[PDB]
Amino acid sequence: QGLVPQGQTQVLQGGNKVPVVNIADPNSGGVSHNKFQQFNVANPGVVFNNGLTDGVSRIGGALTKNPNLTRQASAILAEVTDTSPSRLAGTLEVYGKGADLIIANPNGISVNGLSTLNASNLTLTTGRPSVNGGRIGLDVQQGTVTIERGGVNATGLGYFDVVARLVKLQGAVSSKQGKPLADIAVVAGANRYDHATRRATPIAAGARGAAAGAYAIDGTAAGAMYGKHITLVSSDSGLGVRQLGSLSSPSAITVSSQGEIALGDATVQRGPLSLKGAGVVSAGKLASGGGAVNVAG
Template sequence: MADPNAPGRQRPTVLSAGNGVALVNIQTPSAAGVSRNSYRQFDVGAPGAILNNSRGEAQTQLGGWVGGNPWLATGGARIILNEVNSSDPSRLKGPIEVAGQRAEVVIANPSGIQVDGAAFLNASGVTLTTGTPVFNGGALDAYLVQRGQVSVEGAGLDTRDADATAILARATQLNAALWAQRLKLVSGANTVDAASQLPTGAAPPTGDAPAFALDVAAVGGMYAGQIQLIGTEAGLGVNNQGVISAEGGPLQLRADGWLVNAGRLQSEGELQVQAKGVDNAAGAVIVGERVGLSAEAVTNGEGAVIAARGDLSIQARESISNRRGGLILSGADMALAADRIENRSARIEALGELDVKARVLINANE
């Protein structure tokens, strides 16, 4: 539903394709190629929705042939911004297709976005954000993120048809699977640059702080060629009970709180973690081609594994603890550095050189 209070040049025309699928004639793009569309509510049901970015007739997967969009006399959009002004979250339960010229699709709702079975077709990129878009002339400059959560439930989220996917929210919760090519997730109250999709500074938060910057349930997970996870809000960590898998590498995780991994972090390439602390809980796995962990403290729990097929580095300002049955393993060189290193009834093995630096070293079979 278009927002009747928005300026006319920001109000899309919501129609139906011949088969009843929602068809949105997006507004005329700016000179920078941004089509700005304001809604009172932006929900997508199981049949899906089409964002019409075609000047003439176009064939679509969801609605067959659709007519040209009269708002696009000067050409199609490079970015299709769907800006939601509502106290309710957006609910995405079906596919969203771009008709005509491929474009980046942005859905921005500060009240949150709930995903359950969404996919994106003919989109060059996908951005889901709880931030408020910031413009510089007709160009999309940044997102001001102060509140809101993006959650993925049930049938999950599939953006593999897009080159890149970004989730920019104060918090993200995954109770289902997310599939992407390149995935970037930025959590916390931030100003996020629209082009790089990286935080440029803190923003004043509103509302209660979430428990985690990123919370992945046992039935949840993210699967992408490359993954970059950034949490900037002080004290907010990452809780992974599921699977975070970079199937083409690398996997980069940076959080201003603890990483608690009770599931699996894996990368076919480099895996790098920077956090206040790393708790690789009992039975959990962190594995990559090359692995680097940097934190104040790193704990490898009972039967847990931290492993690299190549080099492995763990740098901890305070302590490294490898507990009963735990395994820290490298297929090449390993470097461990901390004020205190404890290896109790556990194994630390390097198939290459092993470099250990510690003020206190305890290696005991108890």
């Protein structure tokens, strides 16, 4: 239910201490690959130690440099290797050099009131990672990510990506009003997702994600999203994207489905609203402040 590292990764924790992950030394491409038997974050959060010097974290107070490091990471991957899902709540803080965060658990991830500090970008995935130097591929064949009512605060990220077999959106994903707005991508289905290009290519899996007509992405009214660009992608044939949570974006909303699309309200201030599905595509009220709206089943 906690944090149980493997290999060179260490976790400084104990009682009331905010846990500090002494991440593994990164490879030549800047990726620190950290395997865990169990990975969970609870309020107030966790500190990833990407520090070559002693200092102070915002949520955790004083800490020393990470003894594993000969250089700082540009991407920190936490991969769960055993059978338990991950729960994430609180702040994911990177102490030291800012880096991409990737949390991968094929068993599932649930998210409730998540934020970040000094993370460049954040990816939550049920894909199994393949790491080759700087190149990270995520092979999604199973698992659900659920955003619970507490939601995600993406403020300060370039993007927040959720990449899983199925995705449930039951809380808001947004950046704070007037602050640097993150892009949001939700990518469902059996895919290889390349972390550097943020492109999904469909792959074979051992089982279906769900039945024909079931929803690969299912957002309720509580799952409202606000992002610089918002992209929703479902690649499994016959599965739907349902997102009843209002979508709001300054620059683009794009939905691609290999089945149905069913949206509520969606608005883009200065850019295109594009819906492309294999099945029936429907939307409640659409608006674009400079009118690019395309809908195509």
